[PDB]
Amino acid sequence: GWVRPDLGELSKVTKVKTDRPLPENPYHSRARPEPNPEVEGDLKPARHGSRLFFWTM
């Protein structure tokens, strides 16, 4: 009573009902380094201009 699969069927992506748990770390990866702090807040102008030796703006 077995029926041969039609063309296109054995290449279907199927779904599997399992009882084993999902691997929370399949790569055995460690903790990632914490990122650099972002930029935030309002942008005030430069204090006393460019401060390049004598340029007052």
Partner: protein, 63 residues
């Protein structure tokens, strides 16, 4: 000019230039620390963007 005017103008000039000098010293110290530790917004030399990684299931499982 009045001596009051030159005197208080000199105090204004000295405050502005002392602030600029202290800010340049802080600028040197900030640049030294950010080159040394690499934790600030400056000297952030680029690494690989991890948005380029294909996280799809590949052809072989051991990866």
């Amino acid at each position: 000019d009045a001596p009051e005017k030159n005197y208080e103008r000199t105090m204004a000039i000295l405050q502005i230039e002392s602030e600029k000098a202290e800010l340049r010293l802080k600028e040197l110290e900030v640049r030294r620390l950010m080159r040394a530790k690499g934790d600030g917004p400056w000297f952030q030399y680029p690494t690989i963007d991890k948005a380029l990684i294909d996280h799809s299931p590949k052809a072989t499982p051991d990866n």
